[PDB]
Amino acid sequence: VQLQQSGAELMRPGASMKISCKATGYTFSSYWIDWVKQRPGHGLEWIGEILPGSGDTNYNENFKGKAAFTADTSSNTAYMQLTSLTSEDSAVFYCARGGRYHGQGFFDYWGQGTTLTVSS
Amino acid sequence: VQLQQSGAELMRPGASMKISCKATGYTFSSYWIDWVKQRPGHGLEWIGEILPGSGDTNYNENFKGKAAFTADTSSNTAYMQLTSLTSEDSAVFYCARGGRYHGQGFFDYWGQGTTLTVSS
Amino acid sequence: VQLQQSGAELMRPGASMKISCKATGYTFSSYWIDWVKQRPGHGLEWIGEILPGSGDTNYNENFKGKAAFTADTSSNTAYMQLTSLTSEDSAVFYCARGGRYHGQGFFDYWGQGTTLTVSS
Amino acid sequence: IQMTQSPASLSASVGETVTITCRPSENVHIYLAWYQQKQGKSPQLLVYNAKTLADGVPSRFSGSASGTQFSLKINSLQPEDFGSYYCQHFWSIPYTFGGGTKLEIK
Amino acid sequence: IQMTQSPASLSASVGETVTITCRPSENVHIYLAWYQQKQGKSPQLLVYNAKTLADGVPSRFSGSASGTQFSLKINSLQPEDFGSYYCQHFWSIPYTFGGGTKLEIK
Amino acid sequence: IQMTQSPASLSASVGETVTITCRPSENVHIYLAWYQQKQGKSPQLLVYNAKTLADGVPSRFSGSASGTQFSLKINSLQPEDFGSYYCQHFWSIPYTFGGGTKLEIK
Amino acid sequence: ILHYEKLSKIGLVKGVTRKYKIKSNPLTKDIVIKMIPNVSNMSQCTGSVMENYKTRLNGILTPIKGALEIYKNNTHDCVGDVRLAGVCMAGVAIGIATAAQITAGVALYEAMKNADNINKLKSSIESTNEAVVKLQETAEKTVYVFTALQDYINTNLVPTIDKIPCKQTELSLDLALSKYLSDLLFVFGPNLQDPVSNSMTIQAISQAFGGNYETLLRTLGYATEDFDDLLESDSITGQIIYVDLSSYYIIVRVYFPILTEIQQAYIQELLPVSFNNDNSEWISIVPNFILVRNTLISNIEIGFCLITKRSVICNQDYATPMTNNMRECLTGSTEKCPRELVVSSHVPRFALSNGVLFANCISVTCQCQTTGRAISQSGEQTLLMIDNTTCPTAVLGNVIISLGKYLGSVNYNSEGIAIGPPVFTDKVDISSQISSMNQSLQQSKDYIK
Amino acid sequence: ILHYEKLSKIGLVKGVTRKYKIKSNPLTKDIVIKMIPNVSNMSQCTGSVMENYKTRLNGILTPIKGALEIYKNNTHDCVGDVRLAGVCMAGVAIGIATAAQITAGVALYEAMKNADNINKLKSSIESTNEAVVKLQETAEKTVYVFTALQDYINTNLVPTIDKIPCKQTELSLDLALSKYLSDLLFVFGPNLQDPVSNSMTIQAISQAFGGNYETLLRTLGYATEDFDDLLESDSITGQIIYVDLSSYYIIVRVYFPILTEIQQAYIQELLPVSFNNDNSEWISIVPNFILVRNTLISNIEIGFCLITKRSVICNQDYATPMTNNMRECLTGSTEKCPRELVVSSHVPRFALSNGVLFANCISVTCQCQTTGRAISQSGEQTLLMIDNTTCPTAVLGNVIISLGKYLGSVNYNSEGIAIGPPVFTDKVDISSQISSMNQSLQQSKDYIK
Amino acid sequence: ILHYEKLSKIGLVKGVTRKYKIKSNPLTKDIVIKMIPNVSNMSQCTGSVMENYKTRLNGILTPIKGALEIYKNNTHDCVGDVRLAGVCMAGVAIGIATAAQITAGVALYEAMKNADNINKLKSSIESTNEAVVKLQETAEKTVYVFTALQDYINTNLVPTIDKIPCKQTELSLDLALSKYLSDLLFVFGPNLQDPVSNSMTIQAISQAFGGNYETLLRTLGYATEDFDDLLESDSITGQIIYVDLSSYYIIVRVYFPILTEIQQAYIQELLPVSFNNDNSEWISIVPNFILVRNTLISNIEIGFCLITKRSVICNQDYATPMTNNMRECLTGSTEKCPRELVVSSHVPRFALSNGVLFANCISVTCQCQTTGRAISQSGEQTLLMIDNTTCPTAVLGNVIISLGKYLGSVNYNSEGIAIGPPVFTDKVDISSQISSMNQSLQQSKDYIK
Ligand SMILES: *[C@@H]1O[C@H](CO)[C@@H](O)[C@H](O)[C@H]1NC(C)=O
């Protein structure tokens, strides 16, 4: 079980990102893929989650609309699309392997972390 | 099984008797206690019977009202009360142990007989 | 099983015949008795059949009314009564033992053949 | 139901077989009892069902039922059998005793 | 139901296999019988069902059914087989006999 | 559901038993997880149910639940345990992480 | 045959003996039921309700006619010979049928001859203005036409045609027709899958006349000897022989059978009485009604038969076979008669037969009025037999009853009896028992292996 | 007593607990039902219909009177001794009877005293001109007479006596009487074999009044505390105590009981839920209603009892015994509870009890609204228990439901369960199972030999 | 799948094949049923009967409203997240419920939105003076109000208000209302324990309109493709969604489903024919209707389903499991098919399938019309198969029938057949058989010990 993320990038404000997380070693269409934010000095912050295959998604209300989730079962890759980047989006973004069912929200495996830099 | 009667007594006409019969050696509340009259020279005569405990009584029509029956289960004693004694009541009175049920009217055990004397 | 027929006879036209067939060796009231005609040079011709006992009869339409069948179970004898003899009735008549049920119409045993002669 | 008991009085010798009968005025079926009474003593139950002996009664006594009439037989009569003999039906209320047959040892 | 029987007459030698056929005008299924008659005698039942031999008939004769037509085969013909051969359907009333094939020993 | 995590920062020596607690603002029952993060690396799951250790985690760590509050105990602290410790409830949407306790090896 | 003494000892007191009667030899009478009223005297307040009613009736009666025409089109006279029978059917065209369907189709073909005569004067049927009308099917035979709602039209709508608004009269006629259809559809709707069969009772058919079968039977006439027994036992049936989709009527052939008493056959009723065994109360599990025919004991489906005081009237033979164990139980082997525990407080505890009282005196207080003392039942006695040889007059609570004499053994109350195995008759408990002995049998087979 | 946790693990979720109520202590009220209307105001339009109607009514009511006179002629006062009872029967003349028949004959004799008073003023009964009429049976007691068709005569035939031809009025009266007889014969016909018994409900008796038992009950008066429960549970019955064949009326004694709650007795309902076992769906085969009386577990014939929110109302004690295997199954031994395979798609797959949801989440998609993730049922779990300790709010499709807290073990979803043997409850399959184990038992006995 | 030849050899002649249809996807229509007539035009002859009627109706309808308000007060919109569902219940307050009750409560909550619109213009509902009245629930949607006894008031009491005494009119109104309540209480009384559920058919609901469901259905409008099949199979149901105790009306949501044919599923009927074995007559104990779904054989509770010519219509899935022994019996293992002795004289002795006649010619006299000779059945033949290859025309008494050709083996009448074990199907005989095998098993276990 390994989750590989896209490389670090620098984006101007008002642009968009398509962060990718490729998952290997397990049935991609079964386990929820969670997405977590971490800016330095403010701790971790849960962005949302997507169930691949079924297309079920759950959103944090502070991030709904700002971020969207998509899944590709053929290539076993989850996508997070960030729209209207601002100075507050300069953070490290992790893709984590959630559970399969209710009460299993702990994150077994994590990605290496995509560092997003935003500046005018 | 023993039935013990009261002693012989002399009574004036118009008086009353309370003849007692104490029964020992068996369940007093089960067996019917029969009462029998015997004047000399005229044979035996059935007065009546009482079932102790339940209070059921059967009366000879020639003696009903003249004689009454009572039972005391605490002391295991049957009582025959004779009212308005006359010269015809000068007879020997027996208490007998009848049966428990229908068709068992034979008298297993008898008392010694209470001799009543009545004279003006 | 033997079927014995009546002797040969000569009859004037317009007369009647009572051909008899006595059956021995089997239950007479069970098996159909068939009657067959054979004039010389014209092949065999089926006259009819009678089931003894039950009285059931089947008739060829070319011979119905001309010939009638009767059965006597007491003497175990079948009869064909031929009425209004003509020159066409000069033929050899056989009694045959048919089957007992449907599909068994083959003739197991035959009579010796009654030769009827008719002349004016 | 009345009892006609026979004989009213009778004298018999020691060792003689004797019979005392009593006829109820109605059919009482099996239900009948024979009691023996002596002078100055309470009656003792001899027979409680028409052919059944009571406990403690010697097999010397016997009871018989002929349907219409009932009888009590004593075989080899003994001097202690003197006294009075009564019969009761206990078939219906009130219970009726017999007239009382007086048996005297001759 | 008519029978067209072939041949009308036939002469065969001793020991020769011969075949006599008869075609009913309608399908009679299994029901067909082959009889042999000689001069001055009643016919004898040879075959009673299209392929079944009767009791007492030697296994020399045989019967065959081709659905549309029926045939009788004699193997190693013998002099006592001369006479006439008839076929009957017994499928429906009235029962119809064949025309009668005349077999003569050559 | 907010987490009040205590202490915010702490320094402990090698081999010393240490305890880090975090109180959710509501009862989350069994569902709580403890993660450890180091500088420049993704967090690692230490404890996934309030008293259950994850696969590959040494038995040195332990988790305890007191109903109202949850705690993580480290026995015989080692230099590789420096970093930040977070707690998550995964009881309800959205999932909330703890404030993050900074543990420094003294 | 049946051992009544031993059956009575286990609580099965013999009851009344009844005769066995079955319907046979029916007579046929043809009637016409017109399913649409004549509204000629009320046509100003008709509106469009009658056209919709006609469409609904056509939709209802089309499948019936289609099912009849299957046998109408495939039955004819026999041109080959009438020596055996005269009704020829085409079994290939019919395809799938039962014996009852074929017999009913034969009867339908026989009734077609009279249906053709009744089909004449169809204009006279269409012009009927009364609830019951008599016409001449032939010069010597009459036919009765019953109109479904003619009395309501004649006495409820026509006399009030001026006192109320015409729209209210139209609406009331509409609800009358709708209620008639609602009553009819329970019988003549899709449930009438097979209109050919002649098992349709006159009570069910009279739903086309509003449930008034008394009018039909009284108008037709009948033999009054067993009329109520014939009627209540579902023996007077009818068959639809013609359906007209233009005049909206049907022709029904009503059958009036007679009751034949089956000779050397009777039915015995057993009154169940609870009996005492091992300080508990039990009831024997045997059939209550036993059919004895030619000294052959069997069961009978008495739920489909009419039970009267003297005889049991059925429309057909309802006998079913009986197990050899139960047959032996009824002939004296009381060890094979199953029994069920009594946990309910409302069960029969005594019964009377020929003046002799069989009572469970452990559970009820039976006393003798002659002496006033109670009657005793021992722990080894299942039941008590009371007659006037021991208690001429018995009291069982609020009733004092004089008793006859028992004609059986005089030692009834002294002889013993063998008691059968306990059972439980609940369906779920039946499944549980099957499971238990299946598992025990599997264990026994495992030990065998 | 009952082990509700283990029963819930196999799909038997506990339901509402109800009380056990039985009728007792009835009060008696006498009414008169006149079966012939008064047509004195329309006698010109009667004709010969009422002579035929009177003949038909006499034929109908003659067997009822003949069956009553069997007990009328053979019951009297006890002249010997009324110390025990006051009603003397002649058991020799009656011959064959049951306990219920004897009790009903006693009640008939008691009601004869009031029937004699009602038999006075018979001319006043015969002259009634209204549907309901009150007269004075005694100076202090009243009697109500109900005429069968007087309303129809008074409001349908008399007011239209001049607006329609008299023959139409006669025909309408004839069909009205015939329809009344058609309704009546279903109840008072040959099916009334035993008119003595007092188990005949007021609804059945009201067919002599056209099915209007509400009028009878309302006119008589009643206690309104449990009137609907008494009426719907077939507890208000009546008995025919007199039949007059000259004036054509009957006298009915209506009984109004009270409902007594059986102390220390209740009835437990078990909601069946399908559970999962070996990739298949099963239903436990146990009784749905279990009667617990004095800590004794038994079955109950619920089909004859009225079920309400709070209590089960019955007219008698309907308890039946239970097998020891099912009794042990209901007390915790779940290995003895039979189960049946589920092949139908329409079965209950979840239930709610005390705010806690027992669901078969293998067959239904149960999710938690709190997190939006589905709830998992493992292959070794028969059922899932959901409460607000793991999922405060559960969604089962179109419904979102908040859940309570389970008061049982906290390890409900982790503990195992022992599963009973499969069964099949079809009657033909029951016979097949009996055949199979009979053959296997015969084989085992053959091996034994 | 099924081995029809071997089944026909033991008397189970194959019958017509039907499709399997189940209701689904219902459409909803709201109606109002007012349970009290408008007597505004006859108020001088009202008296006090209407107040008593109102009190009685309030007592009847109070428990219904109380049972509805349990779900009315505890169901609302979901304010948390409507991503999964939009109907929130309170499972703690409801306490005990089933899946059907929860679904019905959901449907009640959905219908509340239209019930609130219908509760407007309540004064317009109160003032309805006709049996059927149309009003506007919305500007584009209409609602129909049906008054319980308005036609009787309008056409029987109002026009005769001056021709008869006013007291007679009051008494007739009282009797009409009491008869309406008597009809109504059989359905809406204490038996209506659960008014929430939507399994209540329209026929039962129409008792509040006097049994006239045809008026309701016709006025509402429907699709006529399968209307009679929907109606007769108890598929058109309704649910009470509002009860008003001031105006005395109810609001009913009628559901009109469609019939979906279950794909790759059919139902096979087996005509039972008695067969001959060892000089005796037997019938196979095999289910008459077999449901084959996706090549899976099972039983079906066909008593709850409507049987038509082409398909079997049910309101739900009535499939029940089948024993492996009967499944093997239907696939060819005829040694496992139970048989029962025939002691009744009225049993089917022949049947027809695809023009081929299967007859028990031992007990019936079957003959061939072609030759006039009887057809023989030997002692080792259970049945005779007659086709047009051996007897083109068969006579069985009064019927002559032409036959087709058998499509099975040509050696049908020559091949043997294995016969299963005898059984007895009486319930008492079932208990006796269970007792016998239990005792034999106990003896075998005693020998084992
Ligand atoms: C009484 O018993 C006798 C015995 O012979 C019997 O004949 C009679 O019928 C019985 N009668 C009554 C009224 O008990």
PDB file of N, CA and C in Angstrom, chain H residues 153-198:
ATOM      1  N   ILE H 153     -91.451  -0.477   4.903  1.00  0.00           N
ATOM      2  CA  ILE H 153     -92.890  -0.371   4.675  1.00  0.00           C
ATOM      3  C   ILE H 153     -93.366   1.049   4.953  1.00  0.00           C
ATOM      4  N   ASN H 154     -92.873   1.647   6.039  1.00  0.00           N
ATOM      5  CA  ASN H 154     -93.385   2.943   6.470  1.00  0.00           C
ATOM      6  C   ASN H 154     -92.930   4.079   5.565  1.00  0.00           C
ATOM      7  N   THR H 155     -91.711   4.014   5.030  1.00  0.00           N
ATOM      8  CA  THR H 155     -91.153   5.152   4.309  1.00  0.00           C
ATOM      9  C   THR H 155     -90.923   4.908   2.824  1.00  0.00           C
ATOM     10  N   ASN H 156     -91.107   3.692   2.333  1.00  0.00           N
ATOM     11  CA  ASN H 156     -90.856   3.402   0.928  1.00  0.00           C
ATOM     12  C   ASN H 156     -92.083   2.908   0.186  1.00  0.00           C
ATOM     13  N   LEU H 157     -92.959   2.159   0.848  1.00  0.00           N
ATOM     14  CA  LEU H 157     -94.104   1.544   0.190  1.00  0.00           C
ATOM     15  C   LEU H 157     -95.417   2.252   0.486  1.00  0.00           C
ATOM     16  N   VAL H 158     -95.650   2.651   1.737  1.00  0.00           N
ATOM     17  CA  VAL H 158     -96.869   3.393   2.065  1.00  0.00           C
ATOM     18  C   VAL H 158     -96.930   4.763   1.393  1.00  0.00           C
ATOM     19  N   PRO H 159     -95.894   5.618   1.452  1.00  0.00           N
ATOM     20  CA  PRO H 159     -96.018   6.936   0.806  1.00  0.00           C
ATOM     21  C   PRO H 159     -96.143   6.887  -0.709  1.00  0.00           C
ATOM     22  N   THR H 160     -95.713   5.808  -1.362  1.00  0.00           N
ATOM     23  CA  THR H 160     -95.858   5.659  -2.804  1.00  0.00           C
ATOM     24  C   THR H 160     -96.954   4.668  -3.174  1.00  0.00           C
ATOM     25  N   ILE H 161     -98.032   4.612  -2.391  1.00  0.00           N
ATOM     26  CA  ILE H 161     -99.074   3.623  -2.640  1.00  0.00           C
ATOM     27  C   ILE H 161    -100.005   4.083  -3.754  1.00  0.00           C
ATOM     28  N   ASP H 162    -100.007   5.380  -4.068  1.00  0.00           N
ATOM     29  CA  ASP H 162    -100.888   5.916  -5.095  1.00  0.00           C
ATOM     30  C   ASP H 162    -100.163   6.366  -6.354  1.00  0.00           C
ATOM     31  N   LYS H 163     -98.868   6.657  -6.271  1.00  0.00           N
ATOM     32  CA  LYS H 163     -98.108   7.146  -7.412  1.00  0.00           C
ATOM     33  C   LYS H 163     -97.661   6.041  -8.359  1.00  0.00           C
ATOM     34  N   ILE H 164     -97.717   4.782  -7.938  1.00  0.00           N
ATOM     35  CA  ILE H 164     -97.331   3.662  -8.793  1.00  0.00           C
ATOM     36  C   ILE H 164     -98.459   2.639  -8.779  1.00  0.00           C
ATOM     37  N   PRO H 165     -98.539   1.791  -9.809  1.00  0.00           N
ATOM     38  CA  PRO H 165     -99.551   0.727  -9.807  1.00  0.00           C
ATOM     39  C   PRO H 165     -99.394  -0.200  -8.612  1.00  0.00           C
ATOM     40  N   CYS H 166    -100.535  -0.691  -8.121  1.00  0.00           N
ATOM     41  CA  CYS H 166    -100.546  -1.530  -6.927  1.00  0.00           C
ATOM     42  C   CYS H 166     -99.784  -2.832  -7.138  1.00  0.00           C
ATOM     43  N   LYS H 167     -99.763  -3.344  -8.369  1.00  0.00           N
ATOM     44  CA  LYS H 167     -99.019  -4.569  -8.645  1.00  0.00           C
ATOM     45  C   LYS H 167     -97.522  -4.360  -8.455  1.00  0.00           C
ATOM     46  N   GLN H 168     -97.014  -3.184  -8.831  1.00  0.00           N
ATOM     47  CA  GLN H 168     -95.602  -2.889  -8.614  1.00  0.00           C
ATOM     48  C   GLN H 168     -95.278  -2.805  -7.128  1.00  0.00           C
ATOM     49  N   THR H 169     -96.185  -2.230  -6.332  1.00  0.00           N
ATOM     50  CA  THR H 169     -95.990  -2.202  -4.885  1.00  0.00           C
ATOM     51  C   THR H 169     -95.970  -3.610  -4.306  1.00  0.00           C
ATOM     52  N   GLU H 170     -96.879  -4.470  -4.772  1.00  0.00           N
ATOM     53  CA  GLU H 170     -96.898  -5.856  -4.311  1.00  0.00           C
ATOM     54  C   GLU H 170     -95.605  -6.577  -4.672  1.00  0.00           C
ATOM     55  N   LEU H 171     -95.116  -6.377  -5.897  1.00  0.00           N
ATOM     56  CA  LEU H 171     -93.873  -7.018  -6.315  1.00  0.00           C
ATOM     57  C   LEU H 171     -92.688  -6.505  -5.506  1.00  0.00           C
ATOM     58  N   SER H 172     -92.656  -5.200  -5.223  1.00  0.00           N
ATOM     59  CA  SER H 172     -91.563  -4.640  -4.435  1.00  0.00           C
ATOM     60  C   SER H 172     -91.572  -5.180  -3.014  1.00  0.00           C
ATOM     61  N   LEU H 173     -92.760  -5.308  -2.417  1.00  0.00           N
ATOM     62  CA  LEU H 173     -92.863  -5.933  -1.101  1.00  0.00           C
ATOM     63  C   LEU H 173     -92.391  -7.381  -1.145  1.00  0.00           C
ATOM     64  N   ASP H 174     -92.745  -8.100  -2.212  1.00  0.00           N
ATOM     65  CA  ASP H 174     -92.339  -9.494  -2.346  1.00  0.00           C
ATOM     66  C   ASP H 174     -90.821  -9.628  -2.414  1.00  0.00           C
ATOM     67  N   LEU H 175     -90.167  -8.801  -3.237  1.00  0.00           N
ATOM     68  CA  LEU H 175     -88.707  -8.852  -3.295  1.00  0.00           C
ATOM     69  C   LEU H 175     -88.055  -8.371  -2.007  1.00  0.00           C
ATOM     70  N   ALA H 176     -88.661  -7.415  -1.300  1.00  0.00           N
ATOM     71  CA  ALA H 176     -88.106  -7.002  -0.014  1.00  0.00           C
ATOM     72  C   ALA H 176     -88.122  -8.154   0.984  1.00  0.00           C
ATOM     73  N   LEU H 177     -89.252  -8.862   1.069  1.00  0.00           N
ATOM     74  CA  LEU H 177     -89.346 -10.003   1.976  1.00  0.00           C
ATOM     75  C   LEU H 177     -88.393 -11.119   1.562  1.00  0.00           C
ATOM     76  N   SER H 178     -88.262 -11.358   0.256  1.00  0.00           N
ATOM     77  CA  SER H 178     -87.359 -12.404  -0.219  1.00  0.00           C
ATOM     78  C   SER H 178     -85.901 -12.062   0.068  1.00  0.00           C
ATOM     79  N   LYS H 179     -85.518 -10.792  -0.077  1.00  0.00           N
ATOM     80  CA  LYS H 179     -84.156 -10.387   0.261  1.00  0.00           C
ATOM     81  C   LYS H 179     -83.904 -10.498   1.758  1.00  0.00           C
ATOM     82  N   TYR H 180     -84.908 -10.164   2.574  1.00  0.00           N
ATOM     83  CA  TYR H 180     -84.774 -10.352   4.013  1.00  0.00           C
ATOM     84  C   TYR H 180     -84.556 -11.819   4.357  1.00  0.00           C
ATOM     85  N   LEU H 181     -85.323 -12.715   3.729  1.00  0.00           N
ATOM     86  CA  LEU H 181     -85.143 -14.145   3.973  1.00  0.00           C
ATOM     87  C   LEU H 181     -83.784 -14.630   3.481  1.00  0.00           C
ATOM     88  N   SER H 182     -83.311 -14.098   2.352  1.00  0.00           N
ATOM     89  CA  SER H 182     -82.002 -14.482   1.832  1.00  0.00           C
ATOM     90  C   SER H 182     -80.890 -14.093   2.794  1.00  0.00           C
ATOM     91  N   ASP H 183     -80.965 -12.886   3.359  1.00  0.00           N
ATOM     92  CA  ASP H 183     -79.993 -12.492   4.374  1.00  0.00           C
ATOM     93  C   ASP H 183     -80.126 -13.336   5.636  1.00  0.00           C
ATOM     94  N   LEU H 184     -81.358 -13.659   6.030  1.00  0.00           N
ATOM     95  CA  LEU H 184     -81.604 -14.342   7.296  1.00  0.00           C
ATOM     96  C   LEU H 184     -81.137 -15.794   7.262  1.00  0.00           C
ATOM     97  N   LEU H 185     -81.326 -16.476   6.127  1.00  0.00           N
ATOM     98  CA  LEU H 185     -81.085 -17.913   6.051  1.00  0.00           C
ATOM     99  C   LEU H 185     -79.617 -18.285   6.203  1.00  0.00           C
ATOM    100  N   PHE H 186     -78.700 -17.338   6.009  1.00  0.00           N
ATOM    101  CA  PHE H 186     -77.286 -17.635   6.206  1.00  0.00           C
ATOM    102  C   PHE H 186     -76.970 -17.905   7.669  1.00  0.00           C
ATOM    103  N   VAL H 187     -77.838 -17.470   8.577  1.00  0.00           N
ATOM    104  CA  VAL H 187     -77.593 -17.533  10.011  1.00  0.00           C
ATOM    105  C   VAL H 187     -78.646 -18.378  10.722  1.00  0.00           C
ATOM    106  N   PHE H 188     -79.923 -18.152  10.418  1.00  0.00           N
ATOM    107  CA  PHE H 188     -81.018 -18.826  11.103  1.00  0.00           C
ATOM    108  C   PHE H 188     -81.541 -20.039  10.347  1.00  0.00           C
ATOM    109  N   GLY H 189     -80.876 -20.449   9.275  1.00  0.00           N
ATOM    110  CA  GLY H 189     -81.327 -21.572   8.490  1.00  0.00           C
ATOM    111  C   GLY H 189     -80.939 -22.903   9.101  1.00  0.00           C
ATOM    112  N   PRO H 190     -80.668 -23.895   8.251  1.00  0.00           N
ATOM    113  CA  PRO H 190     -80.213 -25.198   8.762  1.00  0.00           C
ATOM    114  C   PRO H 190     -78.879 -25.142   9.482  1.00  0.00           C
ATOM    115  N   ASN H 191     -78.096 -24.077   9.293  1.00  0.00           N
ATOM    116  CA  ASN H 191     -76.848 -23.922  10.030  1.00  0.00           C
ATOM    117  C   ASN H 191     -77.075 -23.750  11.525  1.00  0.00           C
ATOM    118  N   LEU H 192     -78.243 -23.251  11.935  1.00  0.00           N
ATOM    119  CA  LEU H 192     -78.579 -23.129  13.353  1.00  0.00           C
ATOM    120  C   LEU H 192     -79.040 -24.493  13.867  1.00  0.00           C
ATOM    121  N   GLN H 193     -78.069 -25.401  13.982  1.00  0.00           N
ATOM    122  CA  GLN H 193     -78.361 -26.740  14.475  1.00  0.00           C
ATOM    123  C   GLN H 193     -78.656 -26.735  15.968  1.00  0.00           C
ATOM    124  N   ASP H 194     -77.981 -25.868  16.726  1.00  0.00           N
ATOM    125  CA  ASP H 194     -78.074 -25.828  18.184  1.00  0.00           C
ATOM    126  C   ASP H 194     -78.489 -24.426  18.614  1.00  0.00           C
ATOM    127  N   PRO H 195     -79.794 -24.141  18.654  1.00  0.00           N
ATOM    128  CA  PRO H 195     -80.246 -22.825  19.128  1.00  0.00           C
ATOM    129  C   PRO H 195     -80.178 -22.661  20.635  1.00  0.00           C
ATOM    130  N   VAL H 196     -79.914 -23.732  21.385  1.00  0.00           N
ATOM    131  CA  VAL H 196     -79.881 -23.636  22.840  1.00  0.00           C
ATOM    132  C   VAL H 196     -78.659 -22.849  23.301  1.00  0.00           C
ATOM    133  N   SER H 197     -77.513 -23.062  22.655  1.00  0.00           N
ATOM    134  CA  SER H 197     -76.253 -22.495  23.120  1.00  0.00           C
ATOM    135  C   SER H 197     -76.277 -20.970  23.092  1.00  0.00           C
ATOM    136  N   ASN H 198     -75.573 -20.366  24.051  1.00  0.00           N
ATOM    137  CA  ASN H 198     -75.495 -18.916  24.183  1.00  0.00           C
ATOM    138  C   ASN H 198     -74.171 -18.355  23.672  1.00  0.00           C
TER     139      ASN H 198
END
